[PDB]
Design a binder for these strands. Structure first.
Ligand SMILES: O=c1ccn([C@H]2C[C@H](O)[C@@H](COP(=O)(O)NP(=O)(O)OP(=O)(O)O)O2)c(=O)[nH]1
Ligand SMILES: [Mg+2]
Ligand SMILES: [Mg+2]
Ligand code: NA
Ligand code: NA
Length: 326
DNA sequence: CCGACATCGCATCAGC
DNA sequence: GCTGATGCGC
DNA sequence: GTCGG
């Protein structure tokens, strides 16, 4: 919030290039800049001062100068006036409506909340659930509620089988006082990178949480990734808690540290760290860190015993979860 | 310059 | 049905 | 849009 005007402006630009332009790389660029400016511990006085930060190049620096002089950015004033953009940006806020569907619905003449509720038959299952909880999914989750939600998940998980390990990652593991959703990383000794000795390891846990009415809706579901909806139980006479997004990732137990690294994030932190891994000649995913022969093709999984081992391989100081909120 | 830009699971559709 | 391209998740 | 060779 110290350069909060500049980082917002850049976040708006990022969303424009993503939802309207469909320029994924311009989107990531704006977001990197906004991230490296958010952590910058001084109040930016000029575009040139900002340009010294990596990821802030010439075009962004002039946009900062313009914002500092006037309080605004004309390119954004224009983008806001355009009706196709405004519609597209709005539709992309429904979970499951991306840039393509959004542009597609606009061509169909579907461009308001009202248009979507009246053409529910024109949405896929995810989009239908994303529309139903539209308001709820715009709210943040207070850490106190994350804590309540954590008890239930962990204790319900323990009820299905004491050998599961469930770990709330995401922004919650980085200490955030609020979160957009709850991310849960799941391990069980039966599912390793070697073998799967038990099927439906994820289904059972989803099933338990549906049973106790914690999980209310399913966005998508496969053998290792669940994306759905949950809700904390309310007390008597008390207004209900908003419905919350929940993601659940089942990961081979021997690959826990790579998995907990990835799912802890932030997304921009993983991108910076994975790009540094590439520059150091490594490739990191949620399963393994592997070397790169000049071939291009990744070699074999390196041995990992902690999050820090991954950091060491690319020659970075270890950074605590709270210090990864980029 | 100009090629790269992080990485992948699940849903959906088209081609066969 | 199987395969492969594409969208979408943020 | 930025960055590295
Ligand atoms: O494009 C992405 C998105 C997420 N991720 C990762 C990191 C991340 O923090 C984790 C969970 O994703 P979320 O969408 O839940 N973002 P996060 O939990 O960090 O913040 P919040 O959910 O409160 O907006 O998975 C990526 O690696 N790439
Ligand atoms: Mg999250
Ligand atoms: Mg999530
Ligand atoms: Na720079
Ligand atoms: Na969306």
């Amino acid at each position: 919030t110290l350069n909060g005007g500049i980082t917002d402006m850049l976040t708006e630009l990022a969303n424009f290039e993503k939802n309207v332009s469909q320029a994924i790389h311009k989107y990531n660029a704006y977001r990197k800049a906004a991230s490296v400016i958010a952590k910058y511990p001084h109040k930016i006085k000029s575009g040139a001062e900002a340009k010294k930060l990596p990821g802030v190049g010439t075009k962004i620096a002039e946009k900062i100068d313009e914002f500092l002089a006037t309080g605004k950015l004309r390119k954004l004033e224009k983008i806001r006036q355009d009706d196709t953009s405004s519609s597209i940006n709005f539709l992309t806020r429904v979970s499951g409506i991306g840039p393509s569907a959004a542009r597609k619905f606009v061509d169909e003449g579907i461009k308001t909340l009202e248009d979507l509720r009246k053409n529910e038959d024109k949405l896929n299952h995810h989009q239908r659930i994303g529309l139903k909880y539209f308001g709820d999914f715009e709210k943040r989750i207070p850490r106190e509620e994350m804590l309540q939600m954590q008890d239930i998940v962990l204790n319900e998980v323990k009820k299905v089988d004491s050998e599961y390990i469930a770990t709330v990652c995401g922004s919650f593991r980085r200490g955030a006082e609020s979160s957009g959703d709850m991310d849960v990383l799941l391990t069980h000794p039966s599912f390793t990178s070697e073998s799967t000795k038990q099927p439906k390891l994820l289904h059972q846990v989803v099933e338990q949480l549906q049973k106790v009415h914690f999980i209310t809706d399913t966005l998508s579901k496969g053998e290792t990734k669940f994306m759905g909806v949950c809700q904390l139980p309310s007390k008597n006479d008390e207004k209900e808690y908003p419905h919350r997004r929940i993601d659940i990732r089942l990961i081979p137990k021997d690959q826990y540290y790579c998995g907990v690294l990835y799912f802890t994030g932030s997304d921009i932190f993983n991108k910076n760290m994975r790009a540094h891994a590439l520059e150091k000649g490594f490739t990191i995913n949620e399963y393994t860190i592997r070397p790169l022969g000049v071939t291009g093709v990744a070699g074999e999984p390196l041995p990992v015993d902690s999050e820090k081992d991954i950091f060491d391989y690319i020659q970075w100081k270890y950074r605590e979860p709270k210090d990864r909120s980029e």
